[PDB]
Write a protein that binds this ligand. Structure first.
Ligand SMILES: Nc1ncnc2c1ncn2[C@@H]1O[C@H](COP(=O)(O)OP(=O)(O)OP(=O)(O)O)[C@@H](O)[C@H]1O
Ligand SMILES: Nc1ncnc2c1ncn2[C@@H]1O[C@H](COP(=O)(O)OP(=O)(O)O)[C@@H](O)[C@H]1O
Ligand SMILES: Nc1ncnc2c1ncn2[C@@H]1O[C@H](COP(=O)(O)OP(=O)(O)O)[C@@H](O)[C@H]1O
Ligand SMILES: [K+]
Ligand SMILES: [K+]
Ligand SMILES: [Mg+2]
Ligand SMILES: [Mg+2]
Lengths: 734, 248
């Protein structure tokens, strides 16, 4: 039906633009830039202009938070189209701010909020419409009080907008439009989508679970390092679904004697029961319910048991979802993670560069920036930053922007024009990057890598084999069932140092857009020296929760070398950490699409048990890079560096016969550093590109890292493992 | 504007010397050793001689703790210049110590505190000026009670300074001038500068964070081995910014 649509979140941040689809417009006969009168629930309605985009489905309309709240509806609700009958332009339109959103800032609101928002933008306005505008490092809401030319109008440049004063009191059943929402979360698409899925039916459709009886998820546990926005995500979900958000703070619960703690837990659960669909959020769950063995007080044990029995009592269809955030997935009572109490677990995790960019764009939307703030350069060099680190960085830059113009124009309830006249310059961000101190620097990176097959030259057979083991079971799961045969879940790269094993693993992960986890030799040696091989389990857990994933074990022979050679020190090839890796590999399913890649420069000293079937059964030799791979190395290292066009990198890759990838990396690490040095000397004497002479000067110090004997040994190993037997003449008779 | 400056900490420990910059003096037409009448907040004012130094910026004036407290202002505040119209020398100038800063030490204060401080040093004096002097392994404050030749004067060698007795009670809204400050901290430039940065906007500009909404630092943790003056540094920052220091 043309008068029945479903609400979705708007991609853009436009105040009064709704996105639809061309097939929907086909049955509506509407233009690209016309206006319609959308009628919402509770008799309310608004006027908005439509837009065309292909992201939404045929019968889905995208609306932003402010227009969605104007219609008194939420995501997924039913909204008609009802095109507006072309109401003429407005004349006076009186608008006033809301008292709560204007408190603290006073002055003339025309040149700062009203005029820039209404400049060169014909935005429809109704009597009951309230609109939010971002400026002066704030988000302020304005409500229209009256409109002389009919209740509907369209803002014209000559319209004399009036703002007398006396801000209106906040209404009864209208919520703040800038507190929390899905658009306040940065790049948590997978996790936020998971939470939306688990939470949609229990809360948006409560009577369904009083009439069907299927058990919905009752306990969701958000876990991840601190500062990743778990509380923010829970608040956003509760606000968007409209369910009553009850917040339980771990420290606040545990700061109240030995009485009121239990009373407060019980009262929170009863209040959530008495108040319709609700989300109970228990922030810092490990403060309330840690491992009951490590507790050394009776009241703590009673707190944990009371939480357990409250969670068990929330097995009925009371429409109360209990959410909990912890930084300790393994330091909360295991009895909480059982079925019926906290069944679902969501790992928030570190934001990637895209997520960091999204968070930075969210935190800087109200702030007036400059033109030089890239906001993507910082997002690429904020490694190890959780969203809280990024918020701290943004606030630090903004504060230093205020620390440069601090007492020039006095900020004595201060005027709006001076507030709007601020700017943050990119060098402030580059300053804060050196004063950042990321919290999650020492955290396992789980991200789809940016290495593609372009960054790798040659290795055509290796690329083919890798995509046979990874790309086929992922992108063609129809096979491996028709033929009834599981994909191999592991491969062992072997070859000389510096030949692209890491890049091959990253590129195969990126081709399937799979997560990539790298476990380097120092980490295996850390587990071996400290006898903390139990952490191997955790690594595989991270791989399983991040599926599809490539779990890469670089220099898998590190422990074997640390023990000596092939024998080692008296003992055999088995060690505790590689034994744990074997155990964890046997415990995977091949249906998780977790692929293990081990790399070793010394396949001779590797434990043979890891080469057995059901393990890294395929061995791939990664040889010394051929000339095409050398050209790729040179191009990849030289990209991001201004290099002269006359350099014959193809020629450069011809006498680098037995050179490894690290050899050419050092070749530019020297030529390009000579260029830097020449720049500095010429700048000293005076006060653009890596020339051919720089590359000749660097090649004058070119040495092969891997000797001929080592290459001979690698070739011998490859022969004895790949030359097979004399079965090349086999043929079925007739 | 010639009548709008920003306060900074004084490099030297001189009691009544303020440091400025030559470009600032260019628009003021003042000599190297002349006197000016600096007017502070809350209607208070004092008289002081200026000095030239290149460390401060063009529009920054350096003042020490005692003269800054005489103007009822703190670091970074707005102070005008208003050069003094060359008031003649004083005649009697009666000064008396404050009761709290003199308790425990008694006797004649002329040869120990007054005369050495006023010997070969023409220091301007106002009626409301209170000045601190270091001697006898102590730091003692003296407040002027009266001045016969106009409220402003300049101390002359032949001036008969009078100290009768009866020390004045400590006033209501005036703090002790020798408790804690930035000049009581030794060689913590980096750390003290960091703390000043994080603390300046939240405390000196409170209404800014009721009108902008950017999150300022709410928790600062000073850590280091014992005896490094963390409590001293915190007390100094609180005293200099004027915010209420609550000690737990
Ligand atoms: N085939 C290749 N394609 C792209 N880059 C390569 C290739 N071979 C080597 N390199 C270059 O080698 C450098 C790093 O080598 P890499 O980490 O892949 O080696 P490796 O085979 O894992 O050996 P090692 O264990 O000795 O570090 C990078 O500069 C990379 O560009
Ligand atoms: N994913 C995110 N997107 C946007 N902002 C974030 C994100 N994560 C953290 N922040 C910022 O960090 C601040 C604190 O995050 P917080 O909710 O305490 O983390 P957690 O929920 O993991 O304890 C929030 O005010 C928010 O502004
Ligand atoms: N950096 C410093 N500058 C000047 N005096 C100091 C300094 N550090 C310590 N002191 C002297 O040491 C005494 C005790 O220092 P204290 O404040 O207890 O150290 P902390 O603050 O680290 O506990 C103070 O009375 C002070 O006189
Ligand atoms: K929060
Ligand atoms: K102390
Ligand atoms: Mg939390
Ligand atoms: Mg490797």
């Amino acid at each position: 039906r043309p008068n029945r649509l479903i609400v979705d979140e708007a991609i853009n941040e436009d105040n009064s633009v709704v996105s639809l689809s061309q097939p929907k417009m086909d049955e509506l006969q509407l233009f690209r830039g016309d206006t319609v009168l959308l009628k919402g629930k509770k008799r309310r309605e608004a006027v908005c202009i439509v837009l065309s985009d292909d992201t939404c489905s045929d019968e889905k309309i995208r609306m932003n938070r402010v227009v969605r709240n104007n219609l008194r509806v939420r995501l997924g609700d039913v909204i008609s189209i009802q095109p507006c009958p072309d109401v003429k332009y407005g004349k006076r339109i009186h608008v006033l701010p809301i008292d709560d959103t204007v408190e603290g800032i006073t002055g003339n609101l025309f040149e700062v909020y009203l005029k820039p928002y209404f400049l060169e933008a014909y935005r429809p306005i109704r009597k009951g419409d309230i609109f939010l505008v971002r400026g002066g490092m704030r988000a302020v809401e304005f409500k229209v009080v009256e409109t002389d030319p009919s209740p509907y109008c369209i803002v014209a440049p000559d319209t004399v907008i009036h703002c007398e004063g006396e801000p209106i009191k906040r209404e009864d059943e209208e919520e703040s439009l800038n507190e929390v929402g899905y658009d306040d979360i940065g790049g948590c698409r997978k996790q936020l989508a998971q939470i939306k899925e688990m939470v949609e039916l229990p809360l948006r459709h409560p009577a369904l679970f009083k009439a069907i009886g299927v058990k919905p998820p009752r306990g969701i546990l958000l876990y991840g390092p601190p500062g990743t926005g778990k509380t923010l995500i829970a608040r956003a979900v509760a606000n968007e679904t409209g369910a009553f958000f009850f917040l339980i703070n771990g420290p606040e619960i545990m700061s109240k004697l030995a009485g009121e703690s239990e009373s407060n837990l019980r009262k929170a659960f009863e209040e959530a029961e008495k108040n319709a669909p609700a989300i109970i959020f228990i922030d810092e769950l490990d403060a309330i319910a840690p491992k009951r063995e490590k507790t050394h007080g009776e009241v703590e044990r009673r707190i944990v048991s009371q939480l357990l029995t409250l969670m068990d009592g929330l097995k009925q269809r009371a429409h109360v979802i209990v959410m909990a955030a912890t930084n300790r997935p393994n330091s909360i009572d295991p009895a909480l993670r059982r079925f019926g109490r906290f069944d679902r677990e969501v790992d928030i995790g570190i934001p990637d560069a895209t997520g960091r960019l999204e968070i930075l764009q969210i935190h800087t939307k109200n702030m007036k920036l400059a033109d030089d703030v890239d906001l993507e350069q910082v997002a690429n060099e904020t490694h190890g930053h959780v969203g809280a680190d990024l918020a701290a960085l943004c606030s630090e830059a903004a504060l230093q922007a205020i620390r440069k113009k601090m007492d020039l124009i006095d900020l004595e309830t201060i005027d709006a024009e001076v507030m709007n006249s601020l700017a943050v310059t990119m060098d402030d961000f580059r300053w804060a990057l050196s004063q950042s101190n990321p919290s999650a620097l020492r955290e396992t990176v789980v991200e789809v890598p940016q290495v593609t097959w372009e960054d790798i030259g040659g290795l055509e057979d290796v690329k083919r084999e890798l995509q046979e083991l990874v790309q086929y079971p992922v992108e063609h799961p129809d096979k491996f069932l028709k033929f009834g045969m599981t994909p191999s879940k592991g491969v062992l790269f072997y070859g000389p140092p510096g030949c692209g094993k890491t890049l091959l693993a990253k590129a195969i992960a990126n081709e399937c857009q799979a997560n990539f986890i790298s476990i380097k030799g120092p980490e295996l040696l850390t587990m071996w020296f400290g006898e903390s091989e139990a952490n191997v389990r955790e690594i595989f857990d991270k791989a399983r929760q991040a599926a599809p994933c490539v779990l890469f074990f670089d220099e898998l022979d590190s422990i074997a070398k640390a023990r000596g050679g092939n024998i080692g020190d008296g003992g055999g090839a088995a060690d505790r950490v590689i034994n744990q890796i074997l155990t964890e590999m046997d415990g995977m399913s091949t249906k998780k699409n977790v692929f293990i890649i081990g790399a070793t420069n010394r396949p001779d000293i590797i434990d043979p048990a890891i080469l057995r079937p059901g393990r890294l059964d395929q061995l791939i030799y990664i040889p010394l890079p051929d000339e095409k791979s050398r050209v790729a190395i040179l191009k990849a290292n030289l990209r991001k560096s201004p290099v002269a066009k006359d350099v014959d990198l193809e020629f450069l890759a011809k006498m680098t016969n037995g050179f490894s990838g690290a050899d050419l990396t050092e070749i530019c690490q020297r030529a390009c550093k000579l260029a830097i040095r020449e720049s500095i000397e010429s700048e000293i004497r005076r006060e653009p590109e890596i020339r051919r002479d720089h590359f000749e000067e660097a090649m004058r110090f070119a040495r092969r890292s891997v000797s001929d004997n080592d290459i001979r040994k690698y070739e011998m190993f490859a022969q004895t493992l790949q030359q097979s037997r004399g079965f090349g003449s086999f043929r079925f008779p007739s």
